[PDB]
Design a protein around this nucleic acid. Sequence first.
DNA 1: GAATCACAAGTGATTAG
DNA 2: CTAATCACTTGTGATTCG
DNA 3: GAATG
DNA 4: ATTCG
Lengths: 52, 47, 50, 50
Amino acid sequence: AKKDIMGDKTVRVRADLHHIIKIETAKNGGNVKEVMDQALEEYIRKYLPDKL
Amino acid sequence: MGDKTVRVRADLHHIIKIETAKNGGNVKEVMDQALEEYIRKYLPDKL
Amino acid sequence: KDIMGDKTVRVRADLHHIIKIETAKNGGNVKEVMDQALEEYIRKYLPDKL
Amino acid sequence: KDIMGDKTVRVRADLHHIIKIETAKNGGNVKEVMDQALEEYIRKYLPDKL
DNA sequence: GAATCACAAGTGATTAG
DNA sequence: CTAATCACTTGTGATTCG
DNA sequence: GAATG
DNA sequence: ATTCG
């Protein structure tokens, strides 16, 4: 529901990690944002699971 | 190589924003950690 | 005309993919590649129209 | 077959217009020329990728 | 089918702490 | 000095035109 | 691919 | 069958 109604934010990550994701989303599907979303969700599900 | 701007869900960002404000840290550090951990998990041979 | 926008055009997915990879690996973006690609084509084939 | 989906891309609007205008005079379309320009670009710069 | 559009995703530029 | 956010740029599925 | 003797 | 996108 918060996923639904809310929108975007931006954050600056290590360019070397971002470059990896760029190559990857290029070769295989997807895009930078949806990896970030997933990387972040999994972190929260790992370290902060009461928040999801 | 420094940083690159990326977009993320505002609802997840917010969760990190609230938590790093309450307890230690900032958002960028967490996002970098998550990303790094994501990559080690799913794209281990990269980096 | 520093100012100067884009028109959009639909290109072979297989070629687009090749460029998508390359511009990620190395520098650049898709438009950038198209802008150069097209100017070279015009210079090569109809340079008197520039 | 030899069939291939497409992917939308941005391009310098002046260069597009040169092609639009020139293809108008005869039969052609802008897409045909873009596909050709992109390819000649890839053959020139990335010959082993296609 | 080619050509176009509207918004989504990308990111250098810029401001807040 | 950086993290954080802005606002201009690119990207492209969806849509139009016919 | 919808219509212009 | 061809024009217009």
